[PDB]
Amino acid sequence: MVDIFARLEKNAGGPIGQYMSYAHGYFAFPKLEGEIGPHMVFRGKKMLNWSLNNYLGLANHPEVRKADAEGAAKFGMAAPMGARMMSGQTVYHEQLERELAEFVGKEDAFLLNFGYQGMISIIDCLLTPRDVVVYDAEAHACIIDGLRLHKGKRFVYGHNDMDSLRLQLQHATDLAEEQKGGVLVITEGVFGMKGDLGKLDEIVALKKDFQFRLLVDDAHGFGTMGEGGRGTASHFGVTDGVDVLFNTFAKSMAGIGAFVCGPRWLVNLLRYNMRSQLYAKSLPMPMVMGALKRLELIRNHPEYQQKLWEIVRALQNGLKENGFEIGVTNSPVTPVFMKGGIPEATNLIVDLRENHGIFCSIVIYPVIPKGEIILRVIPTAAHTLDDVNYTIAAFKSVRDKLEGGIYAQMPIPVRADEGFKVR
Amino acid sequence: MVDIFARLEKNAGGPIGQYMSYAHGYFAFPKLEGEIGPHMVFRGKKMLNWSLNNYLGLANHPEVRKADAEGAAKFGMAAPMGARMMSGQTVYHEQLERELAEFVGKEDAFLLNFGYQGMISIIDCLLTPRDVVVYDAEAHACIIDGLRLHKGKRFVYGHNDMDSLRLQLQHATDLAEEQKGGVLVITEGVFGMKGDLGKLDEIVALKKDFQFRLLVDDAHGFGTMGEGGRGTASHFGVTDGVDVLFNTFAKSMAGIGAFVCGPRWLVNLLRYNMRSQLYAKSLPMPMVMGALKRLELIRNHPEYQQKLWEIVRALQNGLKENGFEIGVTNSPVTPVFMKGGIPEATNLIVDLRENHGIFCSIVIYPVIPKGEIILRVIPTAAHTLDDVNYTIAAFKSVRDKLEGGIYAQMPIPVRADEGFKVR
Ligand SMILES: *Cc1c(COP(=O)(O)O)cnc(C)c1O
Ligand SMILES: *Cc1c(COP(=O)(O)O)cnc(C)c1O
Prior knowledge:
The structure is a homodimer.
Chain A: H1 4-11, H2 13-23, E1 32-33, E2 39-42, E3 45-49, H3 62-75, H4 91-104, E4 108-112, H5 115-126, E5 132-136, H6 141-147, E6 153-157, H7 162-179, E7 183-188, H8 200-205, H9 207-210, E8 213-217, H10 232-236, E9 244-248, E10 258-262, H11 264-273, H12 275-278, H13 285-300, H14 303-321, E11 325-326, E12 334-340, H15 342-354, E13 358-359, E14 361-363, E15 371-377, H16 385-403
Parallel strand pairs in A: 3-13, 5-6, 5-7, 7-8, 8-9
Antiparallel strand pairs in A: 1-2, 2-3, 4-10, 9-10, 11-12, 12-15, 14-15
Helix pairs in contact in A: 3-13, 4-13, 5-6, 14-16, 15-16
The structure holds pyridoxal-5'-phosphate (2 copies).
Protein name (chains A, B): 7-keto-8-aminopelargonate synthetase-like enzyme
Binding site for pyridoxal 5'-phosphate (chains A, B): 115-116, 140, 248, 281
Family (chains A, B): Belongs to the class-II pyridoxal-phosphate-dependent aminotransferase family.
């Protein structure tokens, strides 16, 4: 008998504890200070960040800041007490659902209290052990966690690969008639890691051959792809091909909560069956009011999406002009691929921050093979072109030191929060 | 092959759709309007509700409403953009963690974005397929969903029964030595349905005969039980016996989010491993700010808890005086058990609302067996004794008509929202 605490204590605490030791406050859990935007303060110094997922610049929008301040003053954050079924239902929650459904072009929408929870329970509600899933290998964690709720069969197809898909689809369809069940395909509109867009058009094209249901997570696509920001589905003209459309307020909408879209009969079922919404609190009113304003601005200002993509093409082409390796990305997500070890990537970053005033996260060995280094650059419509130029310039300096072994000469910096204790 | 949409379109949509047709807006998704409190408006009429779980009356506390309004004005509702590990970490999140851990008397706390997914992931990283879980049969849905992620063995013990417990620990410990793993017990501090309390003091006494770890969901106990509202653990004086203490802001705290408490080494492990925290947005600042005020008020005002329990004892004893059945509740939860069918329960409630101005939910046949009718009465420190007397009076009238047979003479009322469409 290995006691649970004992195993987690040292046997599990030791390997990842080293990362915590030197990263807490700097490489993990940084503390950005100030109003939300490209220009914030880190550790006493003003900096230019590319780490926020706020694509449309709505976070510090004066109109958004008013609506947020006004809704909280009127309703407080106590807001609709209790779950939506029990006591937390308001006409404002229903107005936002009507406007969201109208925007993305489906019958109905259900305002969710949180994205991660919502996904877990849509996957829970759609699936029965008879049915069979086919999901993209790069699926977000909430999709994976929702899939672990399923006692049925699951088939994983290689990332955005229509050959493994069509292939695994045949295994699903074979198992589906044997088990007397249906088949469900889950992919994303915009994959946040590599930045590539889900090939939705080629996936609905496969609906001619295999007879399936399609679930799409457009968390990174809403406000950013398609007509006026309507998302990746609109971008491919497949809004009718996607049966269930999931979306979150975290990324473009600069906020909290989520919504799922589809036909009225199904959204109503989800209303009465989604455990994560039956048995947890309703989305607060201040968010509801603020989301109403945010959705108003996205509708009224299609310029925000344009300006974002102007920064996207400028940054992406500018980086590719100077031999920087941007991944296979058709979205604003701009990851910069490089080579090096932990002491190189760590020292690289403190050079970018303490010397060039550039703030970005890095993806390193715990996630990506040792030797790989990804700078995660996320352009927002709040960025300027001076921002783009300064960053590419500072990136160019930083690369010369990396390729010239200068960072390999230095040890891992010690920049963790003073006072942080691992035990 | 049964298409997933067809399995739910008419086959799964038919039975519960009738409930939706007549309940939506009245019995299913009521729209309480006004400031949060015992006296709000429903369908044009002012009413006295017992439906919100704001035990300490903090929701509309002026100091709380200022803190909420002030934090939103300063930070907006987007203020911690991105997940906590990436960009959403703030010193205010860490202040609230330090104050919460100090209150409930554990080493460390991790502020979560939402209780439901928080639980799903604390169960996630606590367990491996070798370990074995013993959980109370009445566990909340998020606990159930949480251990559906567990690919190992699970043993369910009968509600608050220390004999069916011991038998399953014996089965667990036996399987734990064969599988070379540990044991974990999950129960609740206050069970929200029947109102009865978890026998925590006894549960930790079983730690003499078996070596397990204990996880407790105090969602209904915080602010409500124990010294100054410290919760059910403090109420039994077994805070040291609870290894992992989960809690939510949705009930007494009158808000959004949650927190888990325990030793620093574990809370740090959870900080770096909880999927629902790594891969979802951080708790907004206005809530952080507000939660700091709410925790200040709880510490500074221990009569909020006493005023609550004065209303509890008055209401419960008054109902027991008049032969109403309150059940086995130890907590503020006051469920009133009665007998009847759906047309009786529904017309009972219409009478309570449209004639007596009393707002409460009912639990009906899909969940509890046909025959029982429980009114869910939730007392709150904002309730008056006049509130208690009027309700018991109205309850006494309503009961004479129920046992008399008047309600059985009427059909199921039609009171759903005009405009709601089932499909
Ligand atoms: C309220 C509730 C939760 C969830 O809290 P939320 O923050 O609303 O998700 C978890 N467990 C229990 C017992 C609850 O009553
Ligand atoms: C951020 C994210 C979510 C979750 O959004 P939250 O509201 O923060 O929980 C879900 N799916 C994807 C792809 C995401 O990037």
